Design an enzyme around this catalytic site. Structure first.
Site, PDB file in Angstrom:
ATOM      1  N   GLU A   1      25.774   7.895 -12.653  1.00 39.56           N
ATOM      2  CA  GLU A   1      26.871   9.133 -12.703  1.00 39.56           C
ATOM      3  C   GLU A   1      27.061   9.862 -10.585  1.00 39.56           C
ATOM      4  O   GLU A   1      28.114   9.662  -9.265  1.00 39.56           O
ATOM      5  CB  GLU A   1      26.339  10.386 -13.001  1.00 39.56           C
TER       6      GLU A   1
ATOM      7  N   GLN B   1       0.487  -1.129   0.420  1.00 38.63           N
ATOM      8  CA  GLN B   1      -0.221   0.526   0.097  1.00 38.63           C
ATOM      9  C   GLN B   1       0.891   0.914   0.023  1.00 38.63           C
ATOM     10  O   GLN B   1       1.132   2.080  -0.782  1.00 38.63           O
ATOM     11  CB  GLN B   1      -0.850  -0.129   1.364  1.00 38.63           C
TER      12      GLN B   1
ATOM     13  N   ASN C   1       3.814  11.300   1.731  1.00 38.66           N
ATOM     14  CA  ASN C   1       4.128  11.592   0.157  1.00 38.66           C
ATOM     15  C   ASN C   1       4.491  12.082  -0.624  1.00 38.66           C
ATOM     16  O   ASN C   1       5.388  11.923  -1.948  1.00 38.66           O
ATOM     17  CB  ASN C   1       2.713  10.335   0.116  1.00 38.66           C
TER      18      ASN C   1
ATOM     19  N   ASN D   1       9.631   7.641   9.705  1.00 37.23           N
ATOM     20  CA  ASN D   1       8.444   8.690   9.921  1.00 37.23           C
ATOM     21  C   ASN D   1       8.417   9.411  10.966  1.00 37.23           C
ATOM     22  O   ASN D   1       8.528  11.017  10.875  1.00 37.23           O
ATOM     23  CB  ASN D   1       6.866   7.936   9.993  1.00 37.23           C
TER      24      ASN D   1
ATOM     25  N   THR E   1       4.136   1.353  14.065  1.00 30.57           N
ATOM     26  CA  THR E   1       2.427   0.517  13.697  1.00 30.57           C
ATOM     27  C   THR E   1       2.269  -0.494  14.270  1.00 30.57           C
ATOM     28  O   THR E   1       0.822  -0.401  14.581  1.00 30.57           O
ATOM     29  CB  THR E   1       2.489   0.738  11.811  1.00 30.57           C
TER      30      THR E   1
ATOM     31  N   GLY F   1       4.386  -7.617   5.172  1.00 30.65           N
ATOM     32  CA  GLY F   1       4.294  -8.385   4.604  1.00 30.65           C
ATOM     33  C   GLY F   1       4.308  -8.007   3.342  1.00 30.65           C
ATOM     34  O   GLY F   1       5.728  -8.811   2.206  1.00 30.65           O
ATOM     35  N   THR F   2       3.778  -7.382   2.285  1.00 29.02           N
ATOM     36  CA  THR F   2       3.574  -7.641   0.982  1.00 29.02           C
ATOM     37  C   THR F   2       5.202  -6.842   0.433  1.00 29.02           C
ATOM     38  O   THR F   2       5.059  -7.638  -0.509  1.00 29.02           O
ATOM     39  CB  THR F   2       2.482  -6.766   0.273  1.00 29.02           C
TER      40      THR F   2
ATOM     41  N   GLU G   1      -2.986  -7.845  -1.281  1.00 26.83           N
ATOM     42  CA  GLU G   1      -4.595  -6.746  -0.920  1.00 26.83           C
ATOM     43  C   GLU G   1      -5.199  -6.759  -2.648  1.00 26.83           C
ATOM     44  O   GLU G   1      -5.114  -5.059  -2.653  1.00 26.83           O
ATOM     45  CB  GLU G   1      -4.181  -6.157  -0.023  1.00 26.83           C
TER      46      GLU G   1
ATOM     47  N   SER H   1       7.769  -1.768   1.311  1.00 27.91           N
ATOM     48  CA  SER H   1       8.263  -1.356   2.883  1.00 27.91           C
ATOM     49  C   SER H   1       9.010  -2.374   3.855  1.00 27.91           C
ATOM     50  O   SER H   1       8.024  -3.920   3.503  1.00 27.91           O
ATOM     51  CB  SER H   1       6.454  -0.505   3.630  1.00 27.91           C
TER      52      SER H   1
END
Lengths: 49, 439, 432, 432
Positions: B254, B11, B228, B206, B179, B144-145, B71, B140
């Site tokens: 470079e 996500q 973002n 973060n 998180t 887990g994804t 997901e 990330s």
């Protein structure tokens, strides 16, 4: 299984013994506390005199 | 020519890619429809858009990116957006089961099921491109994804393309805030994969973003949109000399050639500036020396680490906007003689000069103001090794009694990898301190 | 696609399930007729989780009601929404359980179980893929407890890769309804700890005390308790029913929330429990929610979580507030209240916010936490079971059915092992 | 931000607190409903000190009422502003104190104290940072005196770094309400001198004399006394509520006005106490305020400050006049009235002017000074306690509660030590 559980309650006893050790440490620290208060009063009063 | 393919896993990767693409379209005047409908009043677009977009025979622009997620909820959320007419549905692959902060399933029983599809997709995308330099993999460590699927895909991409640059961009689990709970469990596994099978890795968190926004932008209720936006601006600044030109163009190779001193030490410290709001950009005289000096301030670093604990070995200097070389020379002369900044006793100087004539643009609805010039810093120092130390400490204190490990055992994996990852991290840290030690 | 099959057992289970169905129908905009009368956006896409697509858009409920008494049927059908369910799913026998677990499992659990297995198999085959099965029942009788455990065992034997979540009602010595209630509870706990993924604790006396001292209701009844448990269930399932920014699911919870399979019990809880006159004078903010979610006054057990240590905590929010406030709140709580959670495991709180607010209320958030407070209930249940089993009172009824007494012996041995395990894991020291 | 939590105890304490809340609501422009109807400038920024931010701009009071009799609730709630407070804070028991400090502290101070600690802890945690806690009670009973000492001790044990200021009502032999009042006063004095930061002296007889001989009221009642004490509190608290040029706070005054922790008593007072017909014939100037501020006619204690020497004097002004007149006035007063203050410590008068005048009156100024006049009250209290404790009258009631008589012995021993210290510091000679 019950023997593992009794090992774990023995570990409970060991944690209590750790608390006793830290209590001895705290006793030494509070002795050093009486000492700073005694010094900072008496020596400062000697300086005042 | 200078064309690259972006990879978005998880996500966070998907939303970061969305932010980057929308920034590119607004900055290049690309309309969300995909055409150039501006036939009355033109507002730009006559540039080299081939780096990221593609030009068709009818005047269509097709994005070149990979939006994969285990997901389907994120894919549906993006699909119902206002930019659904820009990309293609074949580029957003859904999935039945997801990892959701799990490495075991997403690496063995979930990620291994969709391999041929994404491989065919990326092969077709590469064939559609002529010149390939590097990749933009967005994932990330907590997700887990973005950890298991990303690792298994990059392991194949490395063995399928050795001559191509392999970049990395993800989020670091903050020591203070977090998180999830199993974040270190996935991180300790993903670090080994990203170290022994990749060339460069960029690590950000973060809490530093929150600190800098509350300190400069002065917001009480932040949101992921500005998070973002900052990352997208950073990425655009990094790949600035590719879409455009300037006095001294700095391509991906470079800077990547010099940013890697050793095969084991490839974790630069990124720092963007100026990170300011609208009011913070009006009554403030901005020059190059001040912002360059501010870039080395730990408060402005995106990684919570004190640079004074260690020292610098390799530094990569970049610019974007109307910048004058005399100011750069003056700043270099100032920083080379600063006693606060520490550096190794062998490297007397190292940095780059990227002059970008195009000034950074603004977004309607964002928080960034109209700044005449921007600056980004990619340095290498050993003071950041503390994060790995804390991560190893946390993993060790979570592994003594094997908390939340029976799930991974049942899923199917060999437990010795935890020991393998632990010893590999210990060796890497040891190498880091050995390098940090001077004569 | 991803649907959830719901199951029913016990008259209390039947009434709470009916209340939950009515609540979700009202929230998602469904008229009692069977058509759709909603006006939202996300109430059409993922609406098929609990409904089924048919002709004319008339969504049908997906729930199988299992009961041994026909008297529960006509009561729940006569309601304003009792005409919307599937009469085929209401499989009832001819003889009552008589608050007997063994008799209900043996006599009323052999010739009637085939029909419910057939219908649930048909429902599962009607869909493509499923995640788990939700069963709501109570341990106070032979209908919910005597049949739900058998059904859960059957479904896990048939489909092991499914989520076994339930909301059985824990008993209480102060407020009792069955003389042989401890026997049934002891019999049911074995199956709960052996052939069940996860289980949530439900108590009526605690809810009564809460609605008395905070809600300040005139004539609180079972309807209020059913409403509260339905709201709790909706708050639990909104992570999947209404996806937001950080969505979650039942299995991710059950994995991250259960340290050991032998300990799969939880403690639910809802934040905004205010009196009627206090609704117009309230401050909608994060710290108030954290306090009503951290104290033991709003929580719904008849025990005290402060007697043990917090093991795992999940904070599921449903609203549009922020992300920083939750993490700072949990951080300062862990720093200050250091003597209330396991020190070995840091960061025992899970963050979860649902961007879609519920219908009728702007702010909502539930608690799924496993604090060290069920040990008292377990030990008192074991003590009362031993007291009654010493002289073997109220036992000839079970003996007359056919089952022997060694089952009670093995059940109490399992209870002793489980309570010893719980008490040795309660004070989890860091080292020797 | 910096907020002050207010506490309540005793029926007289409750009524004076309600009067103060009404006074401040009228001053700052708060309607009885709960909204805001003000028209000033400094009445919106620092308004959160005593209020709390809520939706719709409806500020809520921050005060916990502690009482042992439910008969105060209906009295204080039926008033024009009794519908604006928080009913949850109104914690009451079922049995009265019976003017007993011992019985109230033992019986009615064990099972009821937990709720008030919980609510005050919640109030403290709700805010970010605090300064101190304000409690208004009386020594004439077992409600204010029995509980105020205990709650102050608890809050000091929990949060030592807080301001403990109170306004307890001192008794008087001429105007009495309780037969065992000397016993309660003696018991309360120990806690006041042991576990209290500062305390102010409040007398009803002196206020009655003031309103009789200067105000010339027709039928003076407790409402007038409540209004006067509310005005005095507002004048004391305006240094933080309404910042001006030279602002002050409670802790600076407590540090600068208390030479020794054993002597933390004060002597409050308000300047413009004029009759109804004299309001339209007056000259508003500094010397008149100084004279009414220095004389013993306007002060509100039942004693004579001229019998001793002034120790600490603070003159807090509220208006728009000057700085030079204050210093010249205090200088010439110290030069002339040299035999009324300690010669060892010059410049015992503190200057304080609040640029924000109060609502309804343009000139206001209060007196917070510690003069040598309480020694007579202390010695007469000690004498009456000795006379009553000689033959041990009215003691079986305390003995039957459970506590012994050694407490009275130690209380009177501390009493004698304190009075000896006070009198040997009264004659603060320069040298031998």
């Amino acid at each position: 299984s019950a023997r593992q559980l009794q090992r774990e309650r023995e570990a409970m006893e060991k944690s209590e013994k750790n608390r006793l050790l830290r209590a001895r440490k705290s006793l030494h620290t509070q002795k050093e506390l009486g000492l700073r208060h005694q010094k900072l009063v008496e020596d400062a009063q000697r300086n005042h005199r | 020519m200078r064309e690259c393919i972006s990879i978005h896993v998880g996500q966070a990767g998907v939303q970061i890619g969305n932010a980057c693409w929308e920034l590119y379209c607004l900055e290049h005047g690309i309309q969300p429809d995909g055409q150039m409908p501006s036939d009355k009043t033109i507002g730009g677009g006559d540039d080299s858009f081939n780096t990221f977009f593609s030009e068709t025979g009818a005047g269509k622009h097709v994005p070149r990116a990979v939006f994969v997620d285990l997901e389907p909820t994120v894919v549906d959320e993006v699909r119902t957006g206002t930019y659904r007419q820009l990309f293609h549905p074949e580029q957003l692959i859904t999935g039945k089961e997801d990892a959701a902060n799990n490495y075991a399933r997403g690496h063995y029983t979930i990620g291994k099921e969709i391999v041929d599809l994404v491989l065919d997709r990326i092969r077709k995308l590469a064939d559609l491109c002529t010149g390939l330099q590097g990749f933009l993999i967005f994932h990330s460590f907590g997700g887990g994804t973005g950890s298991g699927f990303a690792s298994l895909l990059m392991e194949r991409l490395s063995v399928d393309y050795g001559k191509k640059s392999k970049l990395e961009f993800a989020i670091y689990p903050a020591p203070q805030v977090s998180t999830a709970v199993v974040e270190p469990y996935n991180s300790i596994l993903t670090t080994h994969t990203t170290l022994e099978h990749s060339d460069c890795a960029f690590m950000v968190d973060n809490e530093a973003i929150y600190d800098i926004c509350r300190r400069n932008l002065d917001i009480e209720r932040p949101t992921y949109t500005n998070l973002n936006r900052l990352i997208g601006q950073i990425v655009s600044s990094i790949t600035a000399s590719l879409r455009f030109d300037g006095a001294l163009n700095v391509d991906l190779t470079e800077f990547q050639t010099n940013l890697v001193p050793y095969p084991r030490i490839h974790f630069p410290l990124a720092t963007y500036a100026p990170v300011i709001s609208a009011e913070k950009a009006y009554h403030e005289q901005l020059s190059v020396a001040e912002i360059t000096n501010a870039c080395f301030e730990p408060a402005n670093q995106m990684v919570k680490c004190d640079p004074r604990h260690g020292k610098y070995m390799a530094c990569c200097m970049l610019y974007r906007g109307d910048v004058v070389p005399k100011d750069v020379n003056a700043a270099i002369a100032t920083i080379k003689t600063k006693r606060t900044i520490q550096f190794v006793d062998w490297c007397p100087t190292g940095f780059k000069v990227g002059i970008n004539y195009q000034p950074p643009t603004v977004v309607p609805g964002g928080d960034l103001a109209k700044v005449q010039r921007a600056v980004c810093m990619l340095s290498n120092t050993t003071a950041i090794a503390e994060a790995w130390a804390r991560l190893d400490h946390k993993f060790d204190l979570m592994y003594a009694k094997r908390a939340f490990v029976h799930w991974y055992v049942g899923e199917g994996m060999e437990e010795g990898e935890f020991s393998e990852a632990r010893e590999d991290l210990a060796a890497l840290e040891k190498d880091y301190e050995e390098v940090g030690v001077d004569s | 696609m991803r649907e959830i099959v719901h199951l029913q057992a016990g008259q209390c289970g039947n009434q709470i399930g009916a209340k939950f169905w009515e609540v979700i129908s009202d929230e998602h905009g469904i008229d009692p007729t069977g058509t759709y009368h909603g006006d939202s956006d996300l109430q059409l896409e993922r609406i098929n989780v609990y409904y089924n697509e048919a002709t004319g858009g008339k969504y049908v409920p997906r729930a199988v009601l299992v009961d041994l008494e026909p008297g529960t049927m006509d009561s729940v059908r006569s309601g304003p929404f009792g005409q919307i369910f599937r009469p085929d799913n209401f499989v009832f026998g001819q003889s009552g359980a008589g608050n007997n677990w063994a008799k209900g499992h043996y006599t009323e659990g052999a010739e009637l179980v085939d029909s419910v297995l057939d219908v649930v198999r048909k429902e599962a085959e009607s869909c493509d893929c499923l995640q788990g099965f939700q069963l709501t029942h109570s341990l106070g009788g032979g209908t919910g407890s005597g049949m739900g455990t058998l059904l859960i065992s059957k479904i896990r034997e048939e489909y092991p890769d499914r989520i076994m979540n339930t909301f059985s009602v824990v008993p209480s010595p102060k407020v009792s309804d069955t003389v042989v209630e401890p026997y049934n509870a002891t019999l049911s706990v074995h199956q709960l700890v052996e052939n069940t993924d996860e289980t949530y604790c439900i108590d009526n006396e605690a809810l009564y005390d809460i609605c008395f001292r905070t809600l300040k209701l005139t004539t609180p009844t079972y309807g209020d308790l059913n409403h509260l448990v339905s709201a709790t269930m909706s708050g639990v399932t909104t992570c999947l029913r209404f996806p937001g920014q950080l969505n979650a699911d039942l299995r991710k919870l059950a994995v991250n929330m259960v340290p050991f399979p032998r300990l799969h019990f939880f403690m639910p809880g809802f934040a905004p429990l205010t009196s009627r006159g206090s609704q117009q004078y309230r401050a909608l903010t994060v710290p108030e929610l954290t306090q009503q979610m951290f104290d033991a006054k709003n929580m719904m057990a008849a025990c005290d979580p402060r007697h043990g240590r917090y093991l795992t905590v999940a904070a599921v929010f449903r609203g549009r507030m922020s992300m920083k406030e939750v993490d700072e709140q949990m951080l300062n709580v862990q720093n200050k209240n250091s003597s209330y959670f396991v020190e070995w495991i840091p960061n025992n709180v899970k963050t979860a916010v649902c961007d879609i607010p519920p219908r009728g209320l702007k702010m909502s958030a539930t608690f799924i936490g496993n604090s060290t407070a069920i040990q008292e209930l377990f030990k008192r249940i074991s003590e009362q079971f031993t007291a009654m089993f010493r002289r073997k009172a109220f036992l000839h009824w079970y003996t007359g059915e056919g089952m022997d007494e060694m089952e009670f012996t093995e059940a109490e041995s399992n209870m002793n092992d489980l309570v010893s395990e719980y008490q040795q894991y309660q004070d989890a020291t860091a080292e020797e």
